[PDB]
Design a protein around this nucleic acid. Sequence first.
RNA 1: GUGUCUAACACAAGGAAGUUUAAGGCAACAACAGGUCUGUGAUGUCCUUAGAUGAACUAGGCUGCACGCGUGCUACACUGA
RNA 2: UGGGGAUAGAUUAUUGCAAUUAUUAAUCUUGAACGAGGAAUGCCUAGUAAGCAUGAUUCAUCAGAUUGUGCUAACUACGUC
Lengths: 58, 95, 180, 95
Amino acid sequence: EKSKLAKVEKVLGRTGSRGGVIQVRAQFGRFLIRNVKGPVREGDILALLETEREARRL
Amino acid sequence: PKKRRNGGRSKHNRGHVNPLRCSNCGRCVPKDKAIKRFNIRNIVDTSAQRDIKEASVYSTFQLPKLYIKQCYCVSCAIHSRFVRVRSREQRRVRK
Amino acid sequence: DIKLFKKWSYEEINIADLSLVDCIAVSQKACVYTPHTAGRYQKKRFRKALCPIVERLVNSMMMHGRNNGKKLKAIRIVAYAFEIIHLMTGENPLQVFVNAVQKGGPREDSTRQAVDVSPLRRVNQAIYLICTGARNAAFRNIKSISECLAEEIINCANESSSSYAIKKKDEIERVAKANR
Amino acid sequence: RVRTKTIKRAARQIVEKYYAKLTLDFQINKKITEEVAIIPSKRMKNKVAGFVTHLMKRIQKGPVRGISLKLQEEERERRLDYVEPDTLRMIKSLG
RNA sequence: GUGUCUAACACAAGGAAGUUUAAGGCAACAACAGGUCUGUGAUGUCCUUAGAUGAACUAGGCUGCACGCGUGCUACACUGA
RNA sequence: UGGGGAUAGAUUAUUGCAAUUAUUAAUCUUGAACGAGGAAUGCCUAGUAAGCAUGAUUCAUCAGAUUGUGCUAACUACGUC
């Protein structure tokens, strides 16, 4: 199937209206900025179903 | 009270000075009164700037700029966070 | 020596998305003869991430109306369900269960925009999805809860459209795809 | 966590009248504090012992504010003991 | 580790316990015309005090039922009876 | 549906002067609605939440109540405006 794996470098901050989203920096040798839901930590894989367009803060 | 000593503007030695119209909404405001922000900005994001450099013909990169000079009326500027309400003493401070 | 239910050693699993492997209880100190350990998981965020996966599964399964807190039957039902998987296919039931958790975990979620989901959240949703499918199949039906659970796990491992877990996972992902 | 003014008040009185009595270890400081000061509750006495131990951690690095010892002041006082161009311009102006 | 590197926080280790160990008791300043004179031999005024609005006795009533709203219980099942 | 016990009939008991507008109790019989609940809205982060009981209070007589007490022992963030 289709999916890619990017490794978390930095947890940037807790975002969104209810605070349940997290802004997160991920490395593919390319740096990415993503928004993730749920408890997460640095140095670990995050699976990306779509890899494209780096994310503005919510 | 009378809040403004200078009228909020370059009133001194002048009668009429032309209105400009607000970038946000077309509200007329005197050029002397108007809230001006230069906004020198690049169109590129950081990842986009990396992708454009990699994509680029040439190593040399001209870095396309946005030169705006965006003028806000008072009502818009306070709404959209270009100014604050300061404090009675602090309303005279040019930083 | 150490084996789950005295019959499943459970010391070796395949990679999945790699993110899953950290969470799951394959290591010899986290593998156990029988699930019941009932720890304290409220100290901080990652304390609950260290839970035995079989204990987490039975606790997830047991909550439902009349059933609340009936943990030993839920262990017997999971034990029976793994036995059903072992009879049905020659693969280890735990391995099939790991595949079902990999398949059941969605990779995106959304707000009014679309977002990724964390590995812990993916595991928690997957376990929940397997138990909800079994529960939905069970309630007001002739099929056994053990039979429903085993069928849901194998079908989710397969990636079948019959699976409630695949159908829900697809729906969550589809809503994420729709939103973006 | 954090410690109150009363806990601090007892700790501050300690060192001021018992500078050289204290040691690094918390248990010995508990005994010293108990020996010097009558503190009615174990929890309160342990907290004061704790804070005095923290004050001990802060000191032993040389001088710091809020306390005084004559010896360092005495040590410091014992310890301490024309026509070139940059000078010239002022002299030349003076005459 | 982070922190004026103070006050202190974060992580790990140790440890029965690390958030002040966990839970209560506790209850400022100043109000509200909040409730209670259907608890008081706490109580003003006003009513009442001999075919008594007191004390006491015999029934009946507080729960009746076109109907509207609180709060609980019992259920809606085979992960059960 | 053998889930369910509304609603009703015949009893023999118990308390009390008095039990009838089923006091309360048991035996047999009678065998309703309810197919998981709209708009709404409650409580809850660790032995909690939930489920299951049970002591005490009122009491001549009685728990579907309140207040305690135990046991069975979850989920999910572990934060944000």
